[PDB]
Amino acid sequence: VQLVESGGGLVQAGGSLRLSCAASGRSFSTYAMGWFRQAPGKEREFVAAISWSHGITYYADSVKGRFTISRDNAKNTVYLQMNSLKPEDTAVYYCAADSIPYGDSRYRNPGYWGQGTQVTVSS
Numbered sequence: 001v002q003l004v005e006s007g008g009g010l011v012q013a014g015g016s017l018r019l020s021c022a023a024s025g026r027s028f029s030t031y032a033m034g035w036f037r038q039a040p041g042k043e044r045e046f047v048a049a050i051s052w053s054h055g056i057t058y059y060a061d062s063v064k065g066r067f068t069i070s071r072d073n074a075k076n077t078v079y080l081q082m083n084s085l086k087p088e089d090t091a092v093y094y095c096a097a098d099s100i101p102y103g104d105s106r107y108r109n110p111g112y113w114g115q116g117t118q119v120t121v122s123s
């Protein structure tokens with residue numbers, strides 16, 4: 001099983017990116033999925049999550065109104081649309097999958113982690 005992030009890059013402040021997390025080896029349609037980030041010299045932090053259940057999403061306060069998480073089960077892919085990017089959004093972004101299917105919104109150590117994609121937002 002592998003999660004692979006793509007869609008990172010270097011963008012002017014105020015611009016947008018769309019990150020993709022493509023899963024292989026297993027359908028994750030029954031699993032909640034999440035995006036996290038780690039800025040240089042800082043700890044990993046939650047960005048957004050999307051349930052297996054239609055329409056249920058969660059966002060860190062710092063990205064509310066700017067980022068949107070979505071998923072496409074036919075492509076086995078989760079997306080992070082990132083609008084109104086700020087220099088403080090510069091980080092490696094990681095996608096992850098819940099440790100169990102059909103989970104609630106309580107904290108669990110994610111069961112699978114990707115290797116990350118770099119996002120750099122210029123001045």
Ligand SMILES: O=C(N[C@H](CO)[C@H](O)c1ccc([N+](=O)[O-])cc1)C(Cl)Cl
Pocket residue numbers: 031032033034035046048049050051052056057058096097098099103104105106107108109110111
């Ligand atoms: O983001 C995730 N887990 C967070 C960690 O804070 C939390 O455990 C969670 C799990 C499920 C969920 N959901 O079903 O929408 C939301 C958050 C995993 Cl889905 Cl990768």
